[PDB]
Every structure is written in structure tokens, then in C-alpha cells.
């Protein structure tokens, strides 16, 4: 198709490996580019951890208000929100918001702990029909993004279908789904990624991810004005370990998609 030729050209110009999956919820049509190749998820995996905790709260009604200690030993490499509460507590709701909206890595590790380890996050993926997602490590080592390493990867197709189910589908209860959507819409880290390639009137909820090998990711739910919502996943990784992030590639991918 025309969009796939432009995405291929974008990829060639970038020097990296680009993975795109679009789901248009109007006709359930999909646009895929390397849609079945594995990419390192990096912080886009935080959506699955937050959703898993939301799923637990459908039975444990007060779970999101449960205070969790933040100790100095819990801090890892990037803890913008958790740093503000060292030797204090944060609720699981506050930790989920911090993980999603600020990409706080300590918050992610507390969510993983609440689920019983990375295997508990992966379990939730399997329970909602995602046989592709795998979380193997905690923060920050899950971001190593080593070429060919299957750990902590998913495919664009699988992540797009799963993000659809979590936010626009009914994999979560009604209150939980709305909470996830609210969190994603309040993301603070996405302005230069998918959002930058889309018309300013469209409302976006997204989760970015970045890692070694210049890995630059964004997954988004998009509500166009007077049009069925879209789900767009853009994964990008590069051959050099210390390569710089390329959020512009995600913005350009989104712009190419939005042209259709």
C-alpha cells in the first residue's frame, strides 16, 4: 500500500528498524509495518503492569488506596515521582499514575512486586489473550534492548490489539478502564512522539518508552474529532548501543498514518 511505502522510506532514512501497528476501530482494519517482529518494549511495558493491578482491584476494591513504602533501596535510575516520597508511602494508584504519566521506574518495580514478579505481569497478558508480550526483568535492566534478545519484548500487532482491549474494549471493568484512559491522557512524556505527528485537535493518550540501542517507542489511543478512535503503536530501535533517541521518527510515522 501507499502508507507502507512511505513507512519503508521513513525507516530507510532513519537507519533503524521501525515497527508500526494501527487499528482503526471504525472498520477494524489494520495497518502493519513489521507488525510481527519483536521489539524491546522498554517503558511501554508499564501499561501492562498498571492494567494488571487495575484488574486485581476489580476484586480487591480498596487495592488502589493501599499505601506502599518507598525506601531508599527501592530507588533505581529514574524516579521523578518516587524520589519525592522517599521514606514515605505512595498508594498503588499514585504508583500507577507515576509509572504511566512520568515513566517512573521505581513505581514500575513496585507494580511488578505487587503482581508477584515479572511472571505476574506476563500472566495478566496471557489472561487477556496476549500470547506475545513477555516481561522478564525489572527496572532498569528490562531496557537493555539487545538486538535479537527476546526478553521484555512484544510485537506491534500484539501490543496494538492489547492496548485496544485495555482502553476501548472490556478486558478491564468499567471503572478500571476509565481510570486507565484518564492516566494515559495525562501522560507528560509524549509531546515529541506520536502526538507531534497528529492534528492538534485530536486527543491522545499514550505511553512512551526508551532504552538502549536508541530504542524509542510510543503506544497510543487516539480519539479523532467526529471519528472512531484509533490505536497506534510505533516501535523503533537502532543498530548502535549508544544511539540517540529518535522521537521524530515516531512523530513522522504517526503523520504518515494520519495521512490515510
Author numbering: 28 to 287
The authors write:
For CTX-M-14 a shift in the ADP distribution and pairwise Cα-RMSD can only be determined above a threshold temperature (ca. 50 °C), corresponding to its in-solution melting temperature. Thus, mapping the torsion angle deviation onto the backbone of the protein structures highlights hinge regions with particular flexibility. In CTX-M-14 these are residues 52-54, 193-196, 226-231 and 251-255, while in XI the region around 25-26, 126-129 and 206-210 shows the largest torsion angle deviation. Taking the general trend into account, the combination of the much higher unfolding temperature of XI in solution, and the gradual increase in ADPs with increasing temperature suggests a different temperature response mechanism of the hyperthermophile XI compared to the mesophilic CTX-M-14. This indicates that the respective response in conformational variability reflects an adaptation to either a mesophilic or a thermophilic temperature optimum, respectively.
Klebsiella pneumoniae CTX-M-14 is a monomeric enzyme that catalyzes the hydrolysis of penicillin-, cephem- and carbapenem-family antibiotics. Streptomyces rubiginosus xylose isomerase (XI, EC:5.3.1.5), is a tetrameric enzyme that facilitates the interconversion of aldoses to ketoses, for example D-xylose into D-xylulose or D-glucose into D-fructose. Here, we show for both systems that a modification of the environmental temperature modulates the underlying structural dynamics as well as the enzyme kinetics.
